[PDB]
Amino acid sequence: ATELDVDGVKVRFTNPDKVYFPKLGKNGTKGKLVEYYLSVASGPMLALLRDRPVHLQRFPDGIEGEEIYQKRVPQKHPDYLETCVVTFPSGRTADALKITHPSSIIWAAQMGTVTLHPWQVRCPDTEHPDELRVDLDPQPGTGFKEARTVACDVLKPLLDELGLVGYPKTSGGRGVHVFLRIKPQWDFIEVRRAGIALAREVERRAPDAVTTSWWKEERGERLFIDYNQNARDRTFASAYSVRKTPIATVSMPLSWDELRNADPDDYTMNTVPDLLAGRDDPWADIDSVQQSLGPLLDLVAADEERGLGDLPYPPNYPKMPGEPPRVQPSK
């Protein structure tokens, strides 16, 4: 129906009045979603996603229709788009959409993408993450207040003690995501081991409130630090992505002070653009220092001296032919 000029690249856009979020009515159309992404796709969202391969969580007929989690780029796609070869945990490879320009994000939205799921690597170095992900995930009986509390009161002081800087965002669900920008010199195995040592230390400092137990039955009313989010090919909403919630919540980057009193429902595709106006980017300095895993990998070796090694991968998580044997779940 229309051709959009997205930072000098023309992008085809159709069906503006298709309803994606039925509780929002007029405010929950595909047009309002694309309008939201147009509002953020040329700002800090692009910088955070630049050169990353992404997977697309698509809802072509709204969040109550069928869901298509798209990893490989479709065999037929616009000429300008760039792709990057990603390696799945089986060893299989595929051409994934690479975010190189605001038009990349708007094309995704035109295809019904509600949520972008970026890899933790930058192309071309798909071997070494430049990001360690801390996923504070409330289990049944807990919610966002537990997540923000542990994030601000336990995790942030620990990072300060280690000489590390973390950047938090709401997940858009009940949880909190914290990013550590790191030098891309460690592979997925070592970044994940570093995240496990960090998770174990947060758990030691707040054992009544935090768990790393692989078995959900053993977790109780605690936050799970999902250490397996640093494995390959795990869903993880990008900063500024809209989520599959009834009110179209957005994964919102915040400062540590904002997070302390934050409510994730405050940030939606209808509220975020006005909230960003005049406000300093709390993640403005994230790329300013590429940090070493040195402190966390020392914690890993220390844990090995306590008799604490690797933790199990997610259930049925594929493995590569020559990959070292993994730790199996207990019982």
Numbering used by the authors: 6 to 336
What does the paper say about this structure?
LigD-deficient cells are also sensitive to oxidative damaging agents, uncovering an unexpected duel role in both excision and DSB repair. Together, these findings establish that the LigC complex operates in excision repair pathways that specifically mends lesions and single-strand breaks in stationary phase. Prim-PolC preferentially binds to and fills-in short DNA gaps.
Prim-PolC retains the same overall fold of the mycobacterial Prim-PolD (PolDom) structure, which can be superposed with an RMSD of 1.712 Å (over 270 aligned positions, Fig. 5a). Shared structural features include the phosphate recognition pocket containing the conserved basic residues (K23, K35 and N20) that facilitate this key DNA interaction. Despite these similarities, Prim-PolC orthologues possess a strictly conserved C-terminal extension whose function has not been ascribed. In the Prim-PolC structure, we observe that this additional C-terminal region (aa 294–336) consists of a conserved alpha helix (residues G299−R311), which lies across alpha helix 4 after which the peptide chain becomes an unstructured loop. Residue P94 packs against a pocket formed of residues Y321, P322, K323 and M324 from Loop 3. Loop 2 residue W219 interacts with Loop 3 residues P316, Y317, P333 and K335 via a mixture of hydrophobic and polar interactions. Again, this has the effect of locking Loop 3 into its current orientation, and also reorients Loop 2 into a more distal position to the active centre, compared to the existing Prim-PolD MMEJ structure.
